[PDB]
């Protein structure tokens, strides 16, 4: 499960809402540890 | 991240060249199909 907002909400062009800024609770190289990761996805890569 | 400002990806086709290209395609379709009829080009019908 990924948590997201818009990358640049303050955009009035064709790209508004196209790039999303998402966060994860991601696996680290050690089995017992997690890391918080922020990354960008395109609208076409995700669904609600 | 984006080092600047967000823009949409796009492709540029010379308009006149494309029109000549279709004219050639239509002329050839007419050789076996529609010698005196109408050829209409349209956008794709749907799917992903």
């Amino acid at each position: 499960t990924l948590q997201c907002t818009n990358y640049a909400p303050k955009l009035r062009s064709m790209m508004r809402g196209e790039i999303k800024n998402c966060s994860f609770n991601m696996t680290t190289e050690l089995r017992d540890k997690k890391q918080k990761v922020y990354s960008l996805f395109y609208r076409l890569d995700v669904v609600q | 991240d984006v080092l600047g400002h967000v823009r949409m990806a796009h492709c540029n086709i010379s308009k006149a060249t494309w029109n000549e290209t279709l004219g050639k395609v239509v002329k050839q379709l007419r050789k076996h199909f529609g010698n005196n009829t109408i050829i209409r080009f349209a956008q794709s019908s749907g799917g992903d």
Partner: antibody
Amino acid sequence: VQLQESGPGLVKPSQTLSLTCTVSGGSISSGSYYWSWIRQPAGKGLEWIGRIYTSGSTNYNPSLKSRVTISVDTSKNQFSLKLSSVTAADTAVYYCAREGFTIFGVVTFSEGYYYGMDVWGKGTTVTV
Amino acid sequence: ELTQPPSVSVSPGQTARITCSGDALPKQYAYWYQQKPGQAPVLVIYKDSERPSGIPERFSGSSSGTTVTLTISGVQAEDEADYYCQSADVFGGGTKLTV
């Protein structure tokens, strides 16, 4: 570019107004710019009236939408504002201004920020 | 859709903090103007804290969520003005700054 407003400095109550603005040293034709009017009652803050594109397309402040027509004379480089019947509540300064916009990308994709009014005139003061 | 304090006042040299808030702000850029009495408003800030060339370094600002702040560091007597902010639906309103 300088902006110079003109119009009646006095209108009767229940009487209409026609205001213009000359774009001096500039033109109304093309560019990323939009033309617009804003009202300022002498003791109040600003109220946007409306905007016009050089294409003729317009956007009016809902508060005055039924009362306002905006038009640009691109042969004269004069920006016009027409108001319906005017009352005491309209005893205000009417300003002419040019709103900006820029371009980063494709113009047809609207890739270009937005600016509010960058270039202002002096304002027509109208007694009602 | 925005609200503003009716006034702010500072001693010369202090930072003025003029704010605007409302529902459009998380999605739209704020723009700010400094209006001297008798003059058309001067744009000081655009696109959330960017300033036009010719505008003093005193003018800066920031935002979070629904609130935007226009900050003037080192406010001088020359800065007293009617300050306005806008976002759209297409305008806002303003605050009186005395020094």
